[PDB]
Design a protein around this nucleic acid. Structure first.
Lengths: 119, 114, 54, 207, 7, 122
RNA sequence: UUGGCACCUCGAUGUCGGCUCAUCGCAUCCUGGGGCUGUAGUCGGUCCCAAGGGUUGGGCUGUUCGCCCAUUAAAGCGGUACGCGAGCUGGGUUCAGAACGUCGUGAGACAGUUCGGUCCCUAUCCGUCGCGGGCGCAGGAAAUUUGAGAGGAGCUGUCCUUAGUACGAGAGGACCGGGAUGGACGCACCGCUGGUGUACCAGUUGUUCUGCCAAGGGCAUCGCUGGGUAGCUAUGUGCGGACGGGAUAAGUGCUGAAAGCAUCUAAGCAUGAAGCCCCCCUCAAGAUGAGAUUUCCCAUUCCGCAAGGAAGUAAGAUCCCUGAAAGAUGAUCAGGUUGAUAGGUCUGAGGUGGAAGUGUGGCGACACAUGGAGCUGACAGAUACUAAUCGAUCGAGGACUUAAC
């Protein structure tokens, strides 16, 4: 069973799309641990969608990737970044494209934080 | 569930023809009345195909004397002697719950020939 | 939903027996220390088994 | 009496010798190795210990390794006693298999039922539900605790709490089929417990 | 009487 | 699954058209009956030409339900209507003719004449 | 029950009837065992023993009660603040408005009627229902357990034989003993039948956005509609109250004297009920009376001359982490790199129903082929790709008498 993360299902989908795309550009983000655990499976599924490289997988990925600029002074979108860099980087590796490393609790609410990175 | 598959592979009924959930066919049902076992024919359109291997069931609906009769059989039962497909219908979905209120030509215009 | 009698000091202290909190799972960091809680990145050196990953 | 204990896999359906359709529960329950024989002159009663589902040496303790050294077998996950079997009829280390049960016999099936968590009185005790309308603010509540005169609640008042996780015995089930090759017992009816949990199948109290 | 209508 | 205050249509030539269930005759007891059970009932609507009149408290046995009746072979049967046949306090029907299909579960009981008068037994 | 008295409460003891949850006593409604009958048999009447279980769905009225309809084995009387409003409703009584009838000059009044009319509380303690942490059980542990005690269950209908037999002029019609099938209740679980299934699939409307077509995203109740995996479920399925022992109650007695007879009894033996104590199920050694069996770890160091106290450790367990067959949190269970615990990947099961692109036919809306296609949340099997890292903490050196060693 998946987590609800205290959000509405539409808010869950929007926050997961935002975190997935933001991980895809910035390559290392710092969230809470349960958000990391919910995010990593979706991110490796989208990397698996990028592995195929065909038009139908790209149109599947376009329904999830938000339209933010990936690489500056190149006009590269994130959707181009999945099919240009991440898929060619993880061609040999079969799964496990992300790892989660825990940090200490947050000051304001005691939230256990985690580092997410593409490996 | 592969152990359940290995248990029930010996009792699968493999001589039955493949049929979609939107065509009409006749079912040869062996019934025991005492002592002779007549085989009554149940012609009608398939409504359901709910999977599960040995737990697969299919539902056949017909209109008899102005009252619609829905009858559901398991797929691999030995009570069914023979299944013949009368004609293949063209449908858009696997569950045909809509046509049990569409008497009478409104079901005929949906169950067209394929 | 109204307290009939006030709680005495001894009953209050007996109820506050389990209100204490435990020592965290803190261990020696192999890079510098000291010290580092288990299954988390060290806040001092930023290392974890054993690369400096920050 | 006789019995054997194992793990259930799930439910399926099997038709047998007619057109009739039988709900069937599948249990892996073989092999079981006799670990210890209880005697009346030493233990005060007659019983045998059965071990099932042997595991790795990493997951077993040194007392667990020493206890199964007498039976010449690996340490096992599940140990339970059977009382009272026909003494002796089994030696220490003899394998109990599914061939002891024929596929027409009547057996007792017991096990730990599925956990439901902390549940209300309506689900836990089957108590009837209050009205949802005509001004009513009352539903899903356990009820009055009792009279005024004892100045207390009587013991045994049914209240919300944890449901499940207790031992449940279902009596007089029938074996549909026995599988000596794949160590399977096919039992008519429903069996308490979740999937891959410990199920003990003992012969019924006849008659 | 004895009407419980305390406000 | 025929209940108290369930309205059934009457599937014979007795004269009644719609009937309302008063009581299920099984036990103290149940509030539901499916197929082959006898129910006490009162006539709400009837034809002008017929022996059974409006408002008579009669006994009837259910012959059709939309609830799926289960058989021993794993098969199921269900209809699109609820129907019943009025009887003279034993298991003989009032009407000389029976319309509509009839479930086979009446043959398990000693309901031979209603099954023989039926045009089709499924 | 209606009363009598006014002992307790007027610095408040909420009062009827229903809903929910029950418990107790038989002066027993049924079921069980009997005696007498003006008991031919079925059905009955009366009086005993028996509370184990069960004792209904409506129409009328605020109503309890009562009448009626349809069943049933029966629809039993009462107590528990006419049980239960810090558990629930205010229809009636019993506020403030307004009428009808009557009384009163009048303001107003009426156990006379009708319309409408604010029901607060975050549980401190004892009680109950569940779940934990300590310490004890003369060494420390891992398992398996006996049972002092306690709780649960306990109900019955219909049909066929015996047998149309006994009995009875007939009509009618058995006791006892077997075999099926039900009702209500309870316990489990989804393999069927269904329900649900807000991170599954498809169709479709309006607007906005991805520069545009195409294809999609956001919002409009999950926008709406048609289905649906796992889990949870009943209305679904399986099972239970079975066969039986011991002492018994009311009864029926045997042998027998006080009292040469008679006698169920004063001694001795029986038989005998859904009562009792077990056999059916469950919790149970905090049962301080702390039980029992199996198998590991061993008998260190330093002080205290004795008692004893500190440090490290063995067997083992925990902190921390991956999770669910578990779960509010603890706890339980499967596991922590000589490994499948979770996620990912691959292959499947099931669900949905024929993806995009391209081509063909048509003026087009659209249909056809590629193609049981595409997609797929918790369902399986493989696979260390990712995370369960390094580590740390707790944990015994076994008191004294008595009989043999």
């Amino acid at each position: 069973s998946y987590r609800k993360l205290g959000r509405t299902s539409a808010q869950r989908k929007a926050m997961l799309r935002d975190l997935t795309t933001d991980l895809i550009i910035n390559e290392r983000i710092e969230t809470t641990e349960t958000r990391a655990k919910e995010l990593r499976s979706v991110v490796e599924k989208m990397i698996t969608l990028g592995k195929r490289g065909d038009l139908h997988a790209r149109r599947q990925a376009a329904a999830y990737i938000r339209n933010e600029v990936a690489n500056e002074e190149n006009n590269q979108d994130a959707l181009q970044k999945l099919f240009s860099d991440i898929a060619t980087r993880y061609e040999e590796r079969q799964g496990g494209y992300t790892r989660i490393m825990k940090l200490g609790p947050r000051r304001g609410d005691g939230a256990p934080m985690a580092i997410i990175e593409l490996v | 569930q592969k152990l359940i598959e290995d248990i029930t592979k010996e009792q699968l009924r493999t001589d039955l023809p493949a049929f979609r959930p939107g065509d009409t066919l006749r079912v040869h049902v062996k019934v025991v009345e005492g002592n002779r076992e007549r085989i009554q024919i149940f012609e009608g359109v398939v409504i359901k195909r709910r999977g599960g291997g040995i737990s697969e069931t299919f539902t056949v609906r017909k209109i008899s004397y102005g009252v619609g009769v829905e009858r559901t059989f398991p797929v691999h039962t030995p009570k069914i002697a023979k299944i013949e497909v009368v004609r293949y219908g063209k449908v858009r979905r696997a569950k045909l719950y809509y046509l049990r209120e569409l008497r009478g030509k409104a079901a005929r215009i949906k169950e067209i020939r394929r | 939903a109204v307290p009939f009698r006030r709680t005495s000091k001894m009953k209050k202290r007996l109820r506050r027996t389990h209100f204490k909190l435990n020592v965290p799972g803190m261990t020696e960091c192999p890079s510098c220390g000291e010290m580092k809680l288990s299954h988390r990145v060290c806040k001092a050196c930023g290392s974890y088994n054993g690369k400096d990953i920050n | 009496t006789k019995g054997i204990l194992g793990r259930k896999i799930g439910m399926t359906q099997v038709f047998a010798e007619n057109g009739d359709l039988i709900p069937v529960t599948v249990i892996e329950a073989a092999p079981n190795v006799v670990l210890q024989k209880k005697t009346a002159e030493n233990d005060g009663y007659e019983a045998i210990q059965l071990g099932f589902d042997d595991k790795r040496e990493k997951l077993s303790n040194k007392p667990e390794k020493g206890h199964v050294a007498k039976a010449e077998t690996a340490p096992k996950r599940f140990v339970k006693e059977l009382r009272g079997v026909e003494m002796d009829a089994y030696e220490v280390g003899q394998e109990v298999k599914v061939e002891i049960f024929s596929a027409g016999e009547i057996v007792d099936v017991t096990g730990v039922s599925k956990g439901k968590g902390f549940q209300g009185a309506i689900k836990r005790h089957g108590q009837s539900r209050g009205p949802m309308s005509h001004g009513s603010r009352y539903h899903r509540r356990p009820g009055s605790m009792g009279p005024v005169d004892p100045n207390r609640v009587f013991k045994g008042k049914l209240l919300p709490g944890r449901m499940g996780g207790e031992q449940i015995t279902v009596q007089n089930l029938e074996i549909v089929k026995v599988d000596a090759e794949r160590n399977l017992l096919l039992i008519k009816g429903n069996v308490p417990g979740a999937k891959k949990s410990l199920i003990t199948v003992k012969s019924a109290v006849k008659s | 009487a004895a009407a419980a209508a305390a406000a | 699954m025929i209940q108290q205050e369930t309205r059934l249509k009457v599937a014979d030539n007795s004269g009644a058209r719609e009937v309302l269930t008063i009581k299920v005759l099984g036990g103290s007891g149940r509030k539901t009956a499916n197929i082959g059970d006898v129910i006490v009932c009162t006539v709400k609507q009837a034809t002008p030409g017929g022996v059974v009149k409006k408002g008579e408290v009669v006994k009837a046995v259910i012959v059709r339900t939309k609830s799926g009746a289960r058989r021993s072979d794993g098969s199921y049967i269900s209809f699109d209507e609820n129907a019943c046949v009025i009887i003279r306090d034993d298991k003989s029907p009032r009407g000389t003719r029976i319309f509509g299909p009839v479930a086979r579960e009446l043959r398990e009981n000693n309901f031979m004449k209603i099954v023989s008068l039926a045009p089709e037994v499924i």
